[PDB]
């Protein structure tokens, strides 16, 4: 299909090679996820999300039909989101949110009405 | 459904005709001339100005203006000092005191409205069970001092006696919507 003239969003430029770029970002995300503990839920769910999207990119070579499958807007918004998930995974590796609750609140902290 | 307000970018080739039309538009200020045409067309329109104060802006019977205290057709005050208007007043603009009148009647001895606290919301006249306190139609009561806008009961009853003929007719026109 013919390359897009604009994405429709100010500041978001057209990607010439969206299939390649998505493959790079999703593959990079799955690499950093192997550094998480196996039991961490963020790893398991993000692996499911990413593999599902990676298989769509492998399946569909048409950009327009790929956008229909991904359901994340223009393919350039999908690429942007893919970069955001990768950036998050690097942060989650240092935050370690999978660890037990750091502290309980006071007993009536969340009791409403008082 | 959505529409584009400024996506007319179906870029096309330019003929001599369209290039000259574009050239004429730039060099002869044609769209600026259309602006002058519009303001010229207003010059010859009848202006919308009314001749205040000999003419007035239209109003409706629901208009919320200067407050008044009303009476029954006998001359007895309608207000029975229930204080519903005072309780609901979102500005606490109403201050009321009451006691048994000499004939045993439940009547007010103080009924004040701070017109500089009041927000002219009409909640008092909705809340009144006896149509005693109303916002009348008058809107021309600007004063030269702050103190003149602290209305007491005598002032509010005089507004009622002053404006009842128009107030009664406005209530007759709207009460079936209330």
């Amino acid at each position: 299909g013919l390359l897009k003239k604009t994405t429709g969003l100010v500041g978001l430029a057209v990607c010439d090679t969206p299939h390649e770029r998505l493959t790079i970002l999703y593959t990079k995300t799955l690499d950093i996820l192997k550094h998480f503990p196996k039991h961490a839920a963020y790893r398991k769910y993000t692996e499911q999300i990413t593999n599902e999207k990676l298989d769509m990119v492998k399946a569909e070579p048409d950009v327009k039909k790929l956008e229909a499958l991904l359901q994340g807007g223009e393919v350039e918004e999908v690429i942007l989101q893919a970069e955001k998930e990768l950036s998050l995974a690097r942060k989650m590796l240092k935050w370690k949110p999978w660890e037990p609750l750091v502290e309980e609140p006071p007993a009536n902290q969340w009791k409403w009405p008082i | 459904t959505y529409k584009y307000v400024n996506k007319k970018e179906q870029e096309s080739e330019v003929d001599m005709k369209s290039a000259t039309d574009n050239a004429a538009r730039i060099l002869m200020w044609t769209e600026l001339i259309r602006g002058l045409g519009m303001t010229l067309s207003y010059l010859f329109r009848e202006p919308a100005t009314i001749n205040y104060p000999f003419e007035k802006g239209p109003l409706s019977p629901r208009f919320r203006g200067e407050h008044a205290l009303r009476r029954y057709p006998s001359g007895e005050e309608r207000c029975i000092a229930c204080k519903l208007c005072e309780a609901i007043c979102p500005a606490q603009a109403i201050t009321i005191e009451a006691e048994p009148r000499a004939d045993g009647s439940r009547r007010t001895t103080r009924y004040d409205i701070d017109m500089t606290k009041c927000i002219y919301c009409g909640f008092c006249q909705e809340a009144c069970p006896v149509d005693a306190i109303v916002e009348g139609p008058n809107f021309e009561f600007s004063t030269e001092t702050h103190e003149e806008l602290l209305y007491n009961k005598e002032k509010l009853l005089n507004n009622g006696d002053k404006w009842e003929a128009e107030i009664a007719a406005n209530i007759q026109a709207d009460y079936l919507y209330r």
């Binding site: - | 519009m38 239209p58 109003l59 409706s60 629901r62 208009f63 919320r64 927000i119 002219y120 919301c121 009409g122 909640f123 909705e126 916002e135 709207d174 919507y177 209330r178």
Partner: protein, 52 residues
């Protein structure tokens, strides 16, 4: 705008701070003849937009 302030004042008695929409609905029903006057305003307004 001055004509639309009249619709406000005709439903609520106030040109601006109507206090007309309340939890549960609206304070009062439309006066008879208001829809016709809103229609008369509405059918000319797009020309006013065109001039601007």
């Amino acid at each position: 705008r001055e004509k639309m302030f009249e619709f406000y004042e005709r439903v609520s008695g106030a040109r601006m701070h109507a206090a007309y929409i309340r939890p549960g609905g609206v304070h009062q029903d439309l006066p008879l003849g208001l829809l016709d006057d809103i229609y008369e305003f509405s059918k000319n307004f797009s020309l006013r937009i065109d001039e601007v």
